[PDB]
Amino acid sequence: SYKSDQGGKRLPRIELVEIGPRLDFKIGRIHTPSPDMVTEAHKKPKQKKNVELDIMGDKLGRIH
């Protein structure tokens, strides 16, 4: 961190230092998934119109 005084009370100045480990990867080959597997690995657990909670609960009903 650095209290940098132009961001004022809030924003600091960030000056990094290397810690590493300094590394360089070379790509070989790749196996890929089946698209049917991709859909399975991207799925939500799945867990209302004119109906709103206010602050304090308060299930409301909009009329229109």
Partner: protein, 276 residues
Amino acid sequence: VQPDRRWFGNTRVISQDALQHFRSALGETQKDTYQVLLRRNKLPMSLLEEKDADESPKARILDTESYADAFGPKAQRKRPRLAASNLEDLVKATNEDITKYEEKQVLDATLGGNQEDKENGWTSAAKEAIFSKGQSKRIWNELYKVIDSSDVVIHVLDARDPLGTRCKSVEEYMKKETPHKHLIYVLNKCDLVPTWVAAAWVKHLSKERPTLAFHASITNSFGKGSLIQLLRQFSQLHTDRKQISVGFIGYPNTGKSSIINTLRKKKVCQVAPIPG
């Protein structure tokens, strides 16, 4: 009843900072003339009360000088409280009390005649009984029945003078005891007023209640299908409820019986030009 560790439990425990989150939250509850509460979210509402009152009601004067000390045979009381200050002050402050007294003798003498008939020695007639009706024990036993029976209340009003028909009085009971109930106004008999007149009314009535305009007749009506569109939303919003009532409140001779007929597009209620 068995013994148990619960019952000796702590049940409905608050979290702390949500209180200040809720004491904040009473300000920003902006109402909608297009929305209705359905569930309430049980909260310890009395802890969320106490707006900034600035009057601090009166000290209990019985604490210092009770009764027997104040007056009687015992009466340990000699000088007045607070025994006001000065003579010219006392001369002053009574002099308007002179005037303010006779002002109401001038003013209420306009209100009477109610003393002259005593010296004339004659009294007025009785109240006619038909002005009582109603105001009857059964006739309000109707009313709390249907209010407790119905889910959404509508409230009809004469277009000729809705202010003479608003009859607040119940809305009072609606807000305080049945918060989930609905109370929409309905303006029927719109064909007796000029066109712009009823137009001006709903603008003075949409600010608080949804207030449909309407004209009831089986064969030549107005504004039915707005109400038919209106009701089913309540049946839509009360999805779980398997069915829903709606009762029609109002003065006598307003079209409560009439409106249902022109909903059902036939004669189902009995109707009459007489009131009851």
